[PDB]
Each structure stands twice: as C-alpha cells, then as structure tokens.
Ligand binder design. Sequence first.
Ligand code: MG
Ligand code: MG
Ligand code: MG
Ligand code: MG
Lengths: 396, 392, 392, 388
Amino acid sequence: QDLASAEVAGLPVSALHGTNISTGRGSEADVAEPIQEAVDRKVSELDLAAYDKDDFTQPMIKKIMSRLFSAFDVTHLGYLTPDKVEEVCRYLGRNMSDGDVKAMKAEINAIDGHVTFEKFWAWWCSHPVHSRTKCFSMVSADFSMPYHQQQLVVHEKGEMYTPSYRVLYFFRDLETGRERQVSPWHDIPLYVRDLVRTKPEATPMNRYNFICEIPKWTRAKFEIATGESFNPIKQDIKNGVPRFYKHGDMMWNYGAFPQTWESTEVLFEAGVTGDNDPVDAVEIGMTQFKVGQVSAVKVLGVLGMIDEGEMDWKVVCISHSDPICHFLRDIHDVPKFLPGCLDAIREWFRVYKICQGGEASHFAFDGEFKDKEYAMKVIDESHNMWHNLRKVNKRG
Amino acid sequence: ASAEVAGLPVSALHGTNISTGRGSEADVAEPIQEAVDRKVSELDLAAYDKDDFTQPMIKKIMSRLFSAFDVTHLGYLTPDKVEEVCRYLGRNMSDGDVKAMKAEINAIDGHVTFEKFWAWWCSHPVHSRTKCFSMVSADFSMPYHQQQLVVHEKGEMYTPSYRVLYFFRDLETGRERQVSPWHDIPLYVRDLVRTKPEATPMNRYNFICEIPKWTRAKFEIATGESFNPIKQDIKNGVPRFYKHGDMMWNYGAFPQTWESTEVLFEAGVTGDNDPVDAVEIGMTQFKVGQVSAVKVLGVLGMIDEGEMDWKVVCISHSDPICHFLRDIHDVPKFLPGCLDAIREWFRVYKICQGGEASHFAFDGEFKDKEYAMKVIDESHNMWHNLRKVNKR
Amino acid sequence: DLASAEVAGLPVSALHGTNISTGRGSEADVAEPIQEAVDRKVSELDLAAYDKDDFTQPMIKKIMSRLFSAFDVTHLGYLTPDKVEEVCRYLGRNMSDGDVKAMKAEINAIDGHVTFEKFWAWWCSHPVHSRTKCFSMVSADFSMPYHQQQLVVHEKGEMYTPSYRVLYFFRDLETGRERQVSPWHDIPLYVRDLVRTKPEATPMNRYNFICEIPKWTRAKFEIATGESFNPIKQDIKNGVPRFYKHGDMMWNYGAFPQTWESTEVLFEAGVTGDNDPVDAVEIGMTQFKVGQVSAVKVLGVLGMIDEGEMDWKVVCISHSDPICHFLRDIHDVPKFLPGCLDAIREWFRVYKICQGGEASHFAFDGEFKDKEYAMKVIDESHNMWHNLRKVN
Amino acid sequence: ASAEVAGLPVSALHGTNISTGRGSEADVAEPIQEAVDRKVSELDLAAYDKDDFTQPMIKKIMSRLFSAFDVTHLGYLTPDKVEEVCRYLGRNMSDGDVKAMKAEINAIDGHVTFEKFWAWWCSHPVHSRTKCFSMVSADFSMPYHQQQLVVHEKGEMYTPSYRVLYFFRDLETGRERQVSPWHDIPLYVRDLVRTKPEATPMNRYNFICEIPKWTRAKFEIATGESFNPIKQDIKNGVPRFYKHGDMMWNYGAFPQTWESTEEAGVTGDNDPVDAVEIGMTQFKVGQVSAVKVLGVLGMIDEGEMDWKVVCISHSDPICHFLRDIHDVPKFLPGCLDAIREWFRVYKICQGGEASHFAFDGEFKDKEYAMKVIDESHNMWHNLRKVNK
Ligand SMILES: [Mg+2]
Ligand SMILES: [Mg+2]
Ligand SMILES: [Mg+2]
Ligand SMILES: [Mg+2]
C-alpha cells in the first residue's frame, strides 16, 4: 500500500538525472562511462534515448552495442566464439533460423573461430533485417475448458398475493440451447468464479450469488420453498391470506445464499443450534431487486441473532453492481459510506417481534457485526453442512 | 419505469380484495364486512393493519377459496377436491394424514361441506416448519479447476532481458504451468452460470496492457517467442519510445486474435500479422503486461502500406463510468475530447520522425461497438485458423 | 451535436491539416503552402504543432509576410507607419509611445511607405524577450461587504424526551460571533453562488433541505413552527414520545426553509394549504442526522389531499449523492432507483391504516409531477412565505 | 463509526425507559408495570408496539414528568408552574386557555397536586393544530446580486486574433459587464451561508483552464492586456506548442494570485500560480471550474520556485475520495509519478536539461499547497494596492 507513498515521496539521484543504457547482463558487465552525447548534454543516456528529438546516431549505437557484446565476453578475451555470437543475436532480438546461423557464421569469417566486436558490428550493419517477425510461436499450455456455460432464466407463474404464485428457475445450456429446470437453492453456485481469474492473485475472492426473497422497501413475505420440488420461491400464505412483517418495511434487499444449510443438528455453542435453513443475507446497495432476483454480491460481515436455541445469521453484503461497492472493503467501511446503516439493520432485527407482542431479540457478541472473514467462514461452513445434507439423502 | 411516475388505476389507489388465484373460475366477490366498515381494502388490511385477520375474517376468505374449487356450484366437494384444496393451501397431505382427515370430517355421502371442512381445518393446526426438505435438482457437475492468472517480471527493464511471463496456478491442486498470454488467456470472459438478464448482451473481454497510460516506452507481446511473453521493444540494444508524445490511455491487445496478411479488408488492404489493438480509456493506469476485463465500444481504422491497423476503443469494467458508456456515442458525453484526442494522436504520431499524417478508413470515423465486436470476432476466427494450420 | 462530431468522419480539411492563418479572414488572400511544407507533404499547421524542429527564420518570413499583406487591404504593396504599429500590436508586441516614435524613426519610411522588407528588417533587429513587462490592472470592482456565515447546530435536552431541541445559529466566519437563527426563516431556500461559474446554459436547481426524520428512523421530529427560532423538537402526546407506527421512513424526510402553504389560498375547488412548510423526501443513499441541512436538487412532487388540504411531498436528491448527476427529472428515478417512486407513494398511501385510518387520497391520481411542476410549487410556497411575513 | 460495528451496551440491547428529560432533576424510575410484564422496555413499547399506551400507562408516565417539575418534593405545583408542564407534555396552551385552566383546575389552595392536574387533563382535550406561528428571526438580509460568469471566444484559433473574453451577468438586472478572469473571478469559492459541516475544512477554488487535457497548443491569461482575456501563444505569427508531448491533465491558473518575489509601479515575467487538474474530464480553453486542492510540486527554475498545484474538479467521480495528496496514488496510481516525470523532462526534447525540484521531488500535502496559494493571494493583494 506504501506503493502509494512511493509516488508522493521524493526521488533518489538515480531517478532525477537518469542512468546509462544498461546491458541487462548484470554485474557481469563493467559499469561504463556514459557516451559523449550524454556527457555533453548533461542528460543521461536513458533520458536521451527516451526524450530527445533525434534517435541515437550510428556512432552512439556502436558504443551501446559494443558494451553488450563485451558483456558476453566474460573471461575478457576480446572476442566471442560463433556460438556465443548467435546467443548475442538472439539476445538483440534477431531470432535467426538454422539457415541464417550458418549463413552468418559463414559471412562473418572467424579466421580462428574468434569473432571480434568489430567483425560482428560490420556483419550486423551489412545484414540489416526488417524484423516483421515472420515466424509466429504457437507454444501454448492449451488447457481444456471442460465446462458448459449456462444462462439463468427466471419465470413467474401464478398470481402474487395468492397461493398460486411461484418464481421458477431454469438453465439454458448455451453450447446446446436446451432448457432445464433447476433449484435456485441447490443448482445456482454459491461462489461465483471465473474460468481464468485475471484479477491479481494478491486480491482475494469475494463474489457470491444472492437470491432475493424480499425486495428492498417491501414487507410482503416470500421464501425459497425448501419443501417443494425444485425449490421455487413461494409467497407466505396461511389460510388463504398473505403474510407480512408488521413492524414495517424491510429496508434492504433480503434473501439467501444458495448451497448453504444451517443445521438444527450442528452446534454453534451449547444450547444454540442451527435453524434448518439457508443462511440469510441483507444486501445494502441502493437498488431494489425483484422477487427471486439473483445477484453477485460481496460479503462484508454478519450479525448473529439467537432465538429459542437457534443461531440465525444475518449476512451483510452488497451487490457488485452498486456504485460504492469498490469502496466497501470490510464491515468497518459500511459506517463511513453508509452511516447509520449497520445501526438500522441491527435495530430492525432487534425489535421487529415486539410489534406483534414479542420481545427484543437476543444477539451473539452483544450485537456486534463480525468482519468479512468471519462471515465467509460461516458461509463456508454452511456450504459444507449443505454438501452433507446432499450426501445423507443420496443413500437414504 | 414511467409506470412508476404515472397516475394509478382506481383499483390501485384504494386497494383490492384477496384473490383466490383460481382466475375467473371464482365469482368476483364483495369485500368482507370488516373491510366495508373500515373503508380499507382486504389486502391493505392484511398488509398494513396493525392486527391479524380475526377468525371470522379468515373463514370468509377461506370460504371463497373453498367455493372456487366448487366449479359446478354443488355446495360441497368430493374428498379428492378437498385434498386438492389442502395442497393449494400449502398443507402437505399423504394417504396417511389424508385418510385420518376424512375420518374426521365424515361426509357419510362424500359431500364435504365448507362448514365441515372449516371445522376440521380449525381443529388440526400444524406448525409448518416443513420437516421434509426437497433434494430434487438438476445437480450439474463442474470438472473444472479454477485457474489463477499469474504474472511475473523477469530480467531488467530498459534492457534486452526484460520479459513478463504468465502462468496458470490451479487453485485446486496449486500446480503452476506457463501459458501464452496470446494463446491461453481467453478473449471472452464468460460466467459459468450467467445470472444477469438474458436480455443483456455480453460485452466482456480480456485486455493485455502493453503500454501504460501516460508513458511512451514501447513493449509488445512477443509473438515470435515461445509462450509469447511481453518483451520490451529494444533495437540494437537501445530501448524504443514513441517520440510524438506519451500514449494517454492504456494501449494494448486482445488475446486469441489475429489479423492476417493473407486476408483482405477491401481491395489493396490486408491484415498486418498482429493481434488486434486496443486503447482502454478509463482513468486507471495499468502496469505493463497487466490483464483486465474491458467493455468494447467502437473502433478506429488506420491503413498504412495497404495494411489495416484497427484501434478498438474500450473501457475497463472497473472504471467508475464503465456502466454509463453504452456504445461509442456515449464516449463524448462523459469523456468529451477523448475520441477526438485519440484520433488526433494516431493521425499525427509519425510526423515528428519525418513521416506524414495517417490515413483512416471511413474518413476517420469511430465505427460503433457492434462493428467493433465483429472485427474482434472475425479476428478471433482468424486466430483459430492460424492455430489449426500448424499442428496440422 | 457534440457526441456525433467526435464519432463522425472528418473533412479532408481536417485529416490533412491546414495553412497557418493570418486570422484576419477574407481580408487576406488564400495562400499556397510554404515549400518546406510542400516538400514534407504535411500541412503548415501540423508541422508547427508536431514536427520536432521549430520553424526557421525563412519559414517565419513567409508567414509574417502573409500577415503584413493582410493589413495591406487595397494591395498597395506597403503600409503606413500607423498601420505598422497596428501589426506590431496584433503580433503581441506591447508598444509604449516611446517605442512607437522610435520604430517610426528606426525604420524610416521617408515617404510614409513601409515595405514588408523594411518591416522585416526592423523586426529582426529589435528582438524582444517578451516576458510581458506591463500588467493590466483594469477590472470590474465588485465588493462584498457582508460576511460569510457558518450554520451551526447545537443539541439541548435528552433525545426522546420533551426537552430535546435542535437549535440553529450563524457563526460570522470573520468575527467569530454566534447568533441564533430560525431554520425555517433564516436558512436560504435557494443556494446561490456569489459568482456562478457553472455553465449559463444550465438552469439552476439547488435548494436547502432541512432534515427532520432521518432515513430508516420513525421518531417524529418536526420544525417547531410555533416556537421562537423554530428549533427541531419531537412530537409528544400525553408525555409519551411519538413514532410512526406504520414503519420507518425510508428516505431522509424534511422540509424546505422559507416556504409556506396557507389554509387561505386555494389550489383547486375546496382545496387549501397544509399551513406548514412544504415537506420533502430526499432519496440519496446517505442518512443525515436530525436537523442536518443539505443542498439538494429537486426532481418532482407527489400531491396528497387530506380534508380539503393539499399535502405536497417533494422528491429531491442530495447533490452529494453518487447518482445525483444522472437524475435530471422525475422520470430518471425509476431508471436508477427502481421501486423508489412506487415505495414512496405506497408509503404515504397507507401509513394511516395502521392506526385505523383509511388509505390516502392523491391529486392527479398520484402521478409524480415533474421538476418544473415541483419547482413552480416551491416558488409559490416562497411567496406565501413572503406574504406570511408581510401580513404579520 | 466503529461504534456502529461494535457490540452494544446491555442497556441498549434491552431497551431503555421513558425519560423525564429534565435530566437528573428527575428520580430514576422503575419501568411502569405493564412494561415489566411485557419484558419490553417503556421506550421500545412506545416506539414499536402496535397499540398506544393504555390510560393507566399514560397516567403513570405523566406522573413521572409532573413530579420532575416538583424539584423540592412539595407534592404539588403552584399554578404558574402548570403552564410549562402542559407544554412539556405536548399540549399547546394559549393565553385564553392558561387563564382558563388556572381557574378551571382552580387550585383553591394554590396547590395543584398531580391527581388534580390529571383530572383536569382528562376532562379537557385541546386540538393543538397550533393556531399561532412564530416569526421570530435573525433577519440577516445579505442582499447581493448573483453574478453568472459568461465566457466568449473571439477571433480565429491558431492565429493572433483568438481571445477568450469573460463577463459577469447580474442575474437580477440581467445586464452584462466585461470583467477580468485574473482579478475578478473569486480565488476562494464561498457560500454566503455555509450549511456544510463546520468541522469540515473549506477547500473549493476556481481553476481557469489554459491548456486542455490531451492537448499541446499553448494559451495563457494575457496579464498585459485590458480585462486579461485569454490569448494564444503566438510568436512571429506562428502558434507555439509543447514539443515534449501533450499535457495529460487540464493545465491552468488560480485567479487572484501572483507568483512574484518583489516597489510602486509595474513588473514583468510573473503569472498567477500554475495548477494541474487531474480529473477524467477535459476542459475547454478558458473554462472555469471549482477544484479541490491536494498538494504541490516545486521546481526551482534559477533560484526561483515554480510551484504546480495538484487539484481535482469537484465534479469528478473520485473527488470525494481524495482527501489529500497521499490519496492520489491510491485511486490514480501512476498519476503523480507521471506528472512529476512530465515536468522533469519536457525541456530535454529541444536540447535542455532535466528540471530540478525542491524537496527532491516530493509532492507537498494539501496544507502546504493552500499555503503557497495564500501567500500568492496576498502577493496578489499587494500588486493590486501598489498600483491603485
Ligand atoms: Mg435463517
Ligand atoms: Mg495491430
Ligand atoms: Mg407540509
Ligand atoms: Mg509558476
């Protein structure tokens, strides 16, 4: 991060005047006196190469060239053997073809196998080569991209505010054009990964799939039907009447993480177990999602609420499409860009049962929002409980 | 959209009753008395009233649902239809729990009346925490190992030894292999499961930065070398630089593309045996050899020595204004002067060295993104041909 | 007509560049390009801009002669010493009367006729290291007697009790003197710059909005119109702090200073004013503190009628918001913040049902008028405010 | 901030009770019993329960507030004390009602116990609606006319006749008057009533663009001409250009400044201070823009400081994230190196040497820069004086 600080800070005397054109052969080449032009101009070789109007003249090139020939002459004999001369050429960028090497060994004429820089220079200048790089290298690693790209398709069926309403999911295999129904809970991957991640290996991964169940600014209850086939989203209707949060509107997109399972058979701490449900999340971005809408989010932290022996996590995340997404690096950043947000979310979950005659909620850690790494470990563990729920059903 | 700003239907402003969901197959009804005395719709009551529906209220709603399944209008339902009602209401019912139900209602004539159903419904409440979870799914596999692109600097800058090499680190096994940024980095960046709307087109390419924003030292993908690392452009041992002035945008190239000499743009103009060129215009300077996802927006066409040299205009998907640039026509709205400047630079860069102004295609016009993507596609096809015509 | 230009093709005129002009229009003969230009196959102007070398004395000569000629309108082949001074003047050479008599002497056109040659000869021998010696002090002399004030807010009492109060003051930034003000009467409605540098072609839309109920809260705070210096206070009933029971207000909710809707001015038939300042809903992503003041851009208004009184709810946005620039009118909201107008309207349509009320009645069927409409409502409100002060 | 992230005090989690607000002047109380029975605090029931407080609850609460005015515990209030308590509990009394209640309650012993107060309270309901509004006001009339900057281009670009003229249009009268960009455009942009947070430092300056981003033709404020319009750098009739390459940021001046080190008359080679605006948006020649100062770079010409202030336009998408010079490499990596590189070498092209910097090339922070600007603003006031 002090890469930033390097820019602001002053520079050494190497960076203010510039250096010699270097050989690239290391301490294996003897540090030289700059060429005459640099010395007369009072500008370094590299600065003259980079910014003077005229290109280096032939005598200047010869100087630089002999500094690079000498550099291969490690035992300091004052000459090179034809084979080293081909190395030099390959190093100068002129990748020669077998025909050429012998052609050059030939034209150079090493009257004793000894090629002096002078002899080289003379050959080099009489055989210019317009390097359009005629041969192209196909050497690749060629890995197999064994994967069928899918396009999610979301269909509404039935009527909202009635028992018929359902949001269904499908996958259109792109390489085959064929459609298949899928479970948003079991089939949409939890982690969103690229085939070839080009972001710096340095930057860790944080891109999760979020399934919206309750739209920002709404209060009508919807949920993943973990009981129904292909687990489509269904509205919460009891006795033909739709249910709602009575406390007020959910002020952030509220939903769940696919391929996750918090089990009432796995403990958090004595007395506290899981709630037999995918982990929930609240994405705080500015845009309202539609019911059942799926979006890529970034996890930032998690709030934990314990109710009747069951740990009920609330993951705080944010849509990668949100203008401020790039500035939220961890939970601690929500307050700076979204002041009061964490506070409202916690209060909402602390008091929402009061309205219908219940009490304030009991949280874990005295209501602390743990940081992203912790939220990710919850999600990860949950992913595993989900993989176990899948295995225990296969055989059974 | 403007549906939100526009006026509302008198059915929306006052509210509506609680529908059954069985369509016109239910006789439109009168609101329940309580909704009448309140002067508030049933739905608004269900949604916003501080209280839950009283039992008498739930019965009238439940009654309408019941009667809706009574399509003939007998005034009762066969136990199979009653079973259909329970399902509809979200109550799982198996031959077991089922039989015990008709044992409880007892319609000595199979005629289950609403009062007899309601009666039974109210005497068998069940906390539906849904005990049986459905595993039914498409369960797709994914034999893939995500690869981490690793970039490494080798040698020394401003000298003939500098190179940027590339590798794939298998995130599952951890093993690392050397790859050609030219041949192995995909041109098209695609999601394994695309969650964005099918109505939304794809426009997401990998761009390889060769010359950084605000600099002028030349570097290029060494198409001639094994695994084509990035090498610096050194001639006779002296580094080379644009003398006209600095490249003011990250300038670079698209992997898996090739414009071939052996192909014509139009009579007289061939390809130029290089991967296609790109100028990414976002605000962030990229490092040499750096790879990023870009949105393509259009292209400038330059012809020299009967050869076509395209300059694809693009913008990193991370740039703050990326989402607002939709096509080439949007660049002047947000980056006024940008295109003008990029064209002017390419129009005159050879003059300080004694050359002349350049000649463009279309009189210097920026073809739009659709034309630009085709230029990328074709060039991608040329790459495939280029690749076959070798192993073979 | 600015996008298009940068995208579109260029005239031959532009792609080849042109001659250095006299800048005196038709009064000058179109000329043939200088030979050095012709030998290069590069326009004169491209050469001066991009060639590595500066123009030589002979090239300058040709350029300066075309200029000189330009002043010689009737082609006499010479100029009067009087016109020569003009040329010197045009070339950027500040000439004090001393210099002028000197030039008339030093050239010496014993017949008043000064040829280009005589002129050129004189120019070359009296080189002048410009450095611009004399500074011009001419200027308008706008004065600012008044002192810049800083709005300061102090809190008194305990929040959620009848004693809490948000008091307003103006601190003189020069004296340090703090003086209590009324958010309602003293904070300016329109935010004005001393010198607007923003483009004139851009209509102003910058207002001060006083926040009463912060985003995501439900405690009823209000500007105390009946108390002196109208500080913010909470609504209390029978000693208990009042809250919205319908649910939290989901946007920053407040009012516009210097506005007023009187119960004595009609709007429609049997439609009066709320007898309060105009209320506002600011939709940015950021929650303000109770009584925090902010510049917002107005986007439209929604009109609620209740008991023959109009209850305007203006939709605006903090200029500080990341998408503020993109919402130019009410129609943009559904495009950047979909659901927002729906939710705001739905909220006000039903917030009273919770406490046994009925759904609200709206004007224009709840359509959201545009910003032109909102802005007319606001200016009117300012005049009722100006009249409310005069009547009193 | 991190307060939002951190755990909460057990009292916050549980919920607090309805306070007297009179501060410690009220005896801390037990939650009324119906609050105890709900296992929900008094304030949570008031803010979140569906129903209003029951009459027995309101009474218990009104009695805690009433007693809180009875600071010496007499057990009753004198009738002058009742008015206040009424307002406090939320009842707008009016001169007519006060007299009326001082009678109606009729404290036939001057004592108004709580029970008497309460009995009166329940038999008398007043429709507040607030009939009288307060017009008390500071009345800080600071009348002035809004001036709108108006810019006009004259002549032909790339020739001696191109000028950019500036004007003020009084938005009241609508009459225009030619002004000078150097002398008349405010260096400090100030709100006559600043509503932004007082704890937030002022940092808003006008920037007059001379050389647009990505261009290399030279323009400058004509310090020698009346109304100092912007002219093009023309010499012997040929327009001048930077030969190193294009300026890659908008380059211009700060109005009302003067970089001189010196009488009673005129002077020469000195200009307003130099600024480099680094936003993504190009500005036309002569365009003016509010900017945020971020730091500065100093070149020593020949014993003379040639400062270049780094700044960003307030309209830029990343303005808000750049708080000081150290923030630029974080959002515009390479931007400062590049600005430094450009100034280090722009004279090599034509046979000159690399420039030398003060502080080895360090970019001083915003504080140091606004200081340089202020001295320059003062230096400007002295010029203004000397001559006039
Ligand atoms: Mg849960
Ligand atoms: Mg190419
Ligand atoms: Mg109002
Ligand atoms: Mg300076």
